Amino acid sequence: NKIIMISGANSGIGHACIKYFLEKSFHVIALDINNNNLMPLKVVQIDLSNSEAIHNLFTQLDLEKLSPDILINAAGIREITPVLHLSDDMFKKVIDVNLVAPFILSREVAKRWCESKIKGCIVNIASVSGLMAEPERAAYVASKHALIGLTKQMAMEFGKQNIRVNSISPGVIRTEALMSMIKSNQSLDTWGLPQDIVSCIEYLISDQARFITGSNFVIDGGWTAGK
Amino acid sequence: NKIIMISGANSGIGHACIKYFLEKSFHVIALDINNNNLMPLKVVQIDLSNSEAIHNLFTQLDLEKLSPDILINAAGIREITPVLHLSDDMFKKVIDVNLVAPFILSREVAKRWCESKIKGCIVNIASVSGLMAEPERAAYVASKHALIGLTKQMAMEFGKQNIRVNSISPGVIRTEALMSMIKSNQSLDTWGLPQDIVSCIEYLISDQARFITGSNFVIDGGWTAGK
Amino acid sequence: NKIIMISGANSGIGHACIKYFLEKSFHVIALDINNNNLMPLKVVQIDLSNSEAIHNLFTQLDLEKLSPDILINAAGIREITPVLHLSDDMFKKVIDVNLVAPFILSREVAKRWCESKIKGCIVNIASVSGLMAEPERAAYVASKHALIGLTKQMAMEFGKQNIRVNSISPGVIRTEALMSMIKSNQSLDTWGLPQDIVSCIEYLISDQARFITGSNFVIDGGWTAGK
Amino acid sequence: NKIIMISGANSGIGHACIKYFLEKSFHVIALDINNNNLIDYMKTDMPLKVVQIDLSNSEAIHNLFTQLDLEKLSPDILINAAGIREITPVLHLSDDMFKKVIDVNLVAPFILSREVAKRWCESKIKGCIVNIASVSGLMAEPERAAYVASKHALIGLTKQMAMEFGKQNIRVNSISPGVIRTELTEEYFSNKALMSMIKSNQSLDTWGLPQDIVSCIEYLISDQARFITGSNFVIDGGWTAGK
Ligand SMILES: NC(=O)c1ccc[n+]([C@@H]2O[C@H](COP(=O)([O-])OP(=O)(O)OC[C@H]3O[C@@H](n4cnc5c(N)ncnc54)[C@H](O)[C@@H]3O)[C@@H](O)[C@H]2O)c1
């Protein structure tokens, strides 16, 4: 049975992955700082902004001889703040969760894949804000741009070991007047849903994605096509 | 049953779509200038650089009530000529097949979908050369960049009518020493195959792609990630 | 003195180059289909959609020994028509002017540069519609994406002969309530002007641009930054 | 005279900016963690202020701004040229080192940019920021996870802050250099094989020099760049055009 590690598991996209992949017979390691909305399911309570906590997670996984075959980096925070009111710590904290955690989680799984000869695969959940900016999101935009780059780099780094690394860039996804604004910035007059991102994860981890690495799949209703 | 029109049907990616989609119970209209390598299948021998033959084909299909639900623009040519020896006609012809035909085919199917309120979708087969240039490929590069732009523009044009328009950008696909230079430009030490593109076409016309429009799906073994 | 050939010379960006570079002691060959808004200036009346007229233009220049050192492809047309009303001839005409003429003109000056060992340079005037789509502009969008791709390819092609090829992508330039929609789509509350493009041209054809080829310079008041 | 604050002033691109802008009569604020190559200049009466600072330390950046405010120095222009670049397999890239690259290459540009913009918005001044990214902000390479991530990030940051401050006439742009011969890349130029590999990945058979970047900075901060914001100007000899 494939083991899949999923960050941000308590909410939104990450949460919608849990039920779905458990139902397809995956063993699931769920990571999140909350667990209130959470079968071979291991739940870990972890603040992914703390690199020491990640490192203790991995010591505990190596002691239980448990290593995932697949990593989904779906934890994310989004500041909602004018840039002049964005503190040094809030900027860093967004970068810690949105970029540093995926880096560290990825380096750790990849180390274990390379040593065992496993053909792992990683899916990074970025955003349309990884390709286009928006007001009041200096840290979110920067971090999501970074994660797209990281995805491309790690694909190159680990490709000769058959480890695939790709990203998904969601547009407006409905989760945990405005609507008019959303519609006039999209081509389609519909909302994305979590399951639209889950199906793309499913495709990107499948055998049918064997030649796919370093790619960013945009799932945005047309947001990024233009103005 | 759904009708899917597929250009470049006689060879490579378009040919691999024919049988695959026949086996999934699609009715198929196959377009190609050759037919030597070609069940509800209609085969049309057509030179897609001739816009008047395209116009006639649509008149015929309207009289037979055989207007497609899905269009796959997979016909393509690539020059292999230094730019100083690339004649006006060679440049025009590559543009006529790789961009003008997809434009006309798309406008025609979309005309019919807006009249009849059908939720059709287009998949355009672009190339990594639509993102990164190469030597001796001025027309191929220009037309593939153009086709990515066209995909964006038509996604926006028709989104309110729930017609989705997407592109796939293949890397080196094995179709009808150099092997080492390919591995050198890729992250993965494997060859893309027609089926890697067919599975992506299949995902992009499926219900699970309902929120996907204007997007370009790169399927290239890491080619475009970097150097 | 350096000779600079400028297309689209009767209007907007190309016209603004004429006086400016004449005043800087360039010899100028001006190309346009009209001449009413038109010293070592050579004016040529020419329909750049007509490929044989371009061939005749070069036949004339070779007799006069007037081969340019610098080419600025500023001729352009943009359709204003919904895509379903965009005819085959009109799509092809936009393509022939916006892409094919830059290609032919570029290949012919590059041929002369390579024979004479001259360090030529080309500047292609693309558009923000070369990066992002908009409604009712299928041809304009496709053609300007194409031109960005052509610029990248010809830079690679001719790099070893020290021929530089770059592009400029203007946003809203004032040339020959809507004013508020333009402000909502830009970061700056000002209008672009032809001189903004002309100064970039002047930098791109200077000795200070020795290491600049294949690049696309965006001059758009923030239009392409996001939404 | 204009005041221009330049990070990475001790070496490379930043040093060449210090020299170039001093020669054109700007008042220069030079920021760098090292100062050996600025000592001679500090002994003259050139209008050069040198601050020794570790830009990876956010509290030290805050102390910089306390010092600038006490000395009445508000720059008109910020050049974020300080940057670092690891050369290491990703599996050997430690948490602290990934973060140090991010801190210098991203966080510091963000903090310095927010602070200058804050003072420009209060005083109604038309400021200008130029961020030095990299071709690695567009195309990845092996053994550069932090560098590639950071440079991608800085391009994004550039676009975001352009949009944020555009109504206040604060322009924010980036430059993405390819291979520029400076102290950071001087390794490469004695190695004949690596020179071939660089030439093979470029369209032009030359190298960039620090002045190719200084000239672009001069353009982007001029009146002739009044309509340019959020943009990224690639200066790479054709590196990024393709393969
Ligand atoms: N030389 C190149 O080929 C090249 C290529 C792409 C991008 N770049 C970018 O250009 C910028 C400058 O590069 P360079 O070639 O001049 O490098 P350099 O190393 O010669 O100069 C960088 C300067 O930044 C300073 N710096 C580094 N960390 C710092 C810290 N914590 N606090 C204060 N100062 C610090 C250094 O001490 C140094 O003086 C960097 O952002 C680099 O990433 C350079």
Numbering used by the authors:
A (entry chain B), B (entry chain C), C (entry chain D): 4 to 41, 49 to 186, 196 to 246
D (entry chain A): 4 to 246
The authors write:
HILDH belongs to the short-chain dehydrogenase/reductase (SDR) superfamily. HILDH reduces the racemic AMKP to (2S,3R,4S)-4-HIL and the other seven stereoisomers of 4-HIL in an NADH-dependent manner, suggesting that HILDH has nearly no stereoselectivity with AMKP. HILDH forms a tetrameric structure, and each subunit consists of seven α-helices, seven β-strands and three 310-helices.
The crystal structure of the HILDH-NADH complex has been determined at 2.20 Å resolution. The subunit structure is divided into two subdomains: the main body and the substrate binding unit. The main body of α/β-folding patterns adopts the Rossmann fold, which is conserved in SDRs. The central β-sheet consists of seven parallel β-strands (β1‒β7) sandwiched between two sets of three parallel α-helices (α1, α2 and α7 on one side and α3, α4 and α6 on the opposite side). The α5 helix and three 310-helices are located on the C-terminal side of the Rossmann fold structure to form the substrate binding unit. Additionally, the electron density map of the nicotinamide ring of NADH is observed clearly in each subunit. No significant structural differences were found between the structures of HILDH-NADH and HILDH-NADH-succinate, with RMSDs of 0.2-0.3 Å for α-carbons.
